[PDB]
């Protein structure tokens, strides 16, 4: 019911030490991402945060 955060990290294709992302693949690695902090709730892996800071790369109208 917790969304089974355990599954497989695409970087290693193996399960173990993985965090749940809400804006990306239900499960992802924190080690491969080299994360030293453990956030709770909807966390954004550097991958989602990186594109979030760039915001709309193209100008609208």
């Amino acid at each position: 019911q917790d969304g089974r955060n355990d599954f497989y990290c695409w970087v290693c294709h193996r399960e173990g030490q993985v965090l749940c992302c809400e804006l990306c693949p239900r499960v992802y690695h924190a080690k491969c991402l080299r994360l030293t902090s453990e956030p709770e709730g909807d966390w954004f892996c550097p991958e989602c945060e990186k594109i979030t800071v760039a915001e709309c790369i193209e100008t609208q109208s």
Partner: peptide, 11 residues
């Protein structure tokens, strides 16, 4: 559940 991930409680 178990210690699947690190939970050192930053707080």
């Amino acid at each position: 559940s178990t210690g699947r991930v690190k939970k050192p409680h930053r707080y």
